[PDB]
Amino acid sequence: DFLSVGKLELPGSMIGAVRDRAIDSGVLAKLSPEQPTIFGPVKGAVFSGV
Amino acid sequence: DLISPALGASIGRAVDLIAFHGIDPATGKAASAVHTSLNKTKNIVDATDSATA
Numbered sequence: 602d603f604l605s606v607g608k609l610e611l612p613g614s615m616i617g618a619v620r621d622r623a624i625d626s627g628v629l630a631k632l633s634p635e636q637p638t639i640f641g642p643v644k645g646a647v648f649s650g651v
Numbered sequence: 652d653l654i655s656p657a658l659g660a661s662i663g664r665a666v667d668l669i670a671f672h673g674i675d676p677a678t679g680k681a682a683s684a685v686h687t688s689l690n691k692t693k694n695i696v697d698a699t700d701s702a703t704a
Contacts, residue, residue, distance in 0.1 A: 648653050651661055 665676040673681060673688035
């Protein structure tokens with residue numbers, strides 16, 4: 602027998618903390634702009650056209 | 652903002668429709684006061700899958 606490295610149980614090195622994939626936050630920000638109103642059931646009238 | 656401009660375009664579409672199909676823009680029936688349209692030409696080409704050609 603001899604004196605190995607497995608006795609010491611040396612701590613490893615931390616690479617860091619990384620996400621698996623890029624974050625998908627949605628697409629409705631590009632298509633239609635946000636219309637921020639106050640709290641309450643919002644209503645609106647529309648006309649088809651011609 | 653809405654009603655008046657739409658009603659204003661409603662005739663601009665009417666003339667364009669009369670000159671192309673001789674139709675009454677109100678009802679999908681052919682007009683009697685209109686004799687000729689740009690649809691009744693004999694130089695027609697049956698559309699295919701190509702569309703480009």
